[PDB]
Amino acid sequence: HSKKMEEGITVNKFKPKTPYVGRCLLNTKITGDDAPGETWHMVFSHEGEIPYREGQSVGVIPDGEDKNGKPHKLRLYSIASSALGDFGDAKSVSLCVKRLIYTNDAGETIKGVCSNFLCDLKPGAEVKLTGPVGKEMLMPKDPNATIIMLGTGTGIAPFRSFLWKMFFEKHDDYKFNGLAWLFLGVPTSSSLLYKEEFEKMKEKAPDNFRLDFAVSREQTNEKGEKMYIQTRMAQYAVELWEMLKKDNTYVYMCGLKGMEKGIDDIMVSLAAAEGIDWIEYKRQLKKAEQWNVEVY
Ligand SMILES: Cc1cc2nc3c(=O)[nH]c(=O)nc-3n(C[C@H](O)[C@H](O)[C@H](O)COP(=O)(O)OP(=O)(O)OC[C@H]3O[C@@H](n4cnc5c(N)ncnc54)[C@H](O)[C@@H]3O)c2cc1C
Ligand SMILES: Nc1ncnc2c1ncn2[C@@H]1O[C@H](COP(=O)(O)O)[C@@H](O)[C@H]1OP(=O)(O)O
């Protein structure tokens, strides 16, 4: 029945009342000092106890108590590593995390709880994890699919997961031969997450992988508009629209809630030109498992 790799997935092997306790192996800042905000890539040991698949998330329970002396609520993070992991042994899990800093009502600076807990982690520290969680972002079973990936910021995470599996790994029962097209919206060049990895992939499979960046604060279109992901998509409108009409095309979107509207804004217009109501067409795609969304 499913078009996605849903068979034999694990879900919530570990729960908040009984998390798995893993350890921090590495924690590196992957954005430049220039960047507006910090994003870190961190890898934890799970010794094979968390049997996740590409596209799933884990929950993290930050250490400490809430204001009622209870344990903090879990926060969800998409896994940024493939099932084998960054070390190829299936015993680690990686996260891509933005440090959340804001000012409250009184002008006071407030640090987000889990994000600052995670970005401050030192190798050797323990971390409580739950999950795995999710079925929405699982990859398509079809190894010849056209997979379009639209992410903003940390929303690159699940796509890194997919792409490692597709392009950096050898699998007995899976060999990707379709077309993968990643669009990634970030603010600055010092914020182009995992670009070096994607450039290696592109070199390996030039015919199977397309890559486009939308560097919001550095790029403008012709009208001098800010290069958001939707802005960059428009430049390929005809192409993308054609792709959307095929049954073997799967769209995945991950990142800021905001991107979702912007993209709908472009599609409404593209479709209307062909006499199609985007709202119904999108509903049909969602039902056919071709339009997959995880924004937050
Ligand atoms: C499915 C899923 C996957 C996700 N994947 C990831 C991922 O891979 N990487 C990642 O970094 N995050 C991801 N997130 C977000 C993550 O779950 C946390 O929400 C994020 O790290 C912030 O949590 P925190 O505990 O640091 O902040 P909290 O202490 O929970 O602070 C959050 C609160 O900050 C406030 N806030 C935020 N900005 C402002 C502002 N400008 N002004 C006033 N208040 C503000 C709001 O009250 C908000 O609810 C994901 C979320 C979901 C649901
Ligand atoms: N509504 C939106 N639609 C598309 N991209 C967005 C939207 N809001 C913010 N962005 C961009 O998403 C990226 C988020 O990455 P990061 O977490 O590193 O900041 C940035 O380039 C940010 O642009 P900007 O901040 O210049 O408005």
Give a written overview of the molecule.
One of its GO terms (biological process) is electron transport chain. Keywords: Chloroplast, Electron transport, FAD, Flavoprotein, Membrane, NADP, Oxidoreductase, Photosynthesis, Plastid, Thylakoid, Transit peptide, Transport. Its EC number is 1.18.1.2. Belongs to the ferredoxin--NADP reductase type 1 family. It is built from seven helices and 13 strands. The chain has 296 residues and is of the alpha/beta class. It has two domains: 1-133, Beta Barrel (Elongation Factor Tu (Ef-tu), domain 3), CATH 2.40.30.10; 134-296, Nucleotide-binding domain of ferredoxin-NADP reductase (FNR) module (Rossmann fold, 3-Layer(aba) Sandwich), CATH 3.40.50.80. Helix 3 links the parallel strand 10 (179-186) and strand 11. The longest helix is centred in the C-terminal third of the chain and has 16 residues, at 257-272.
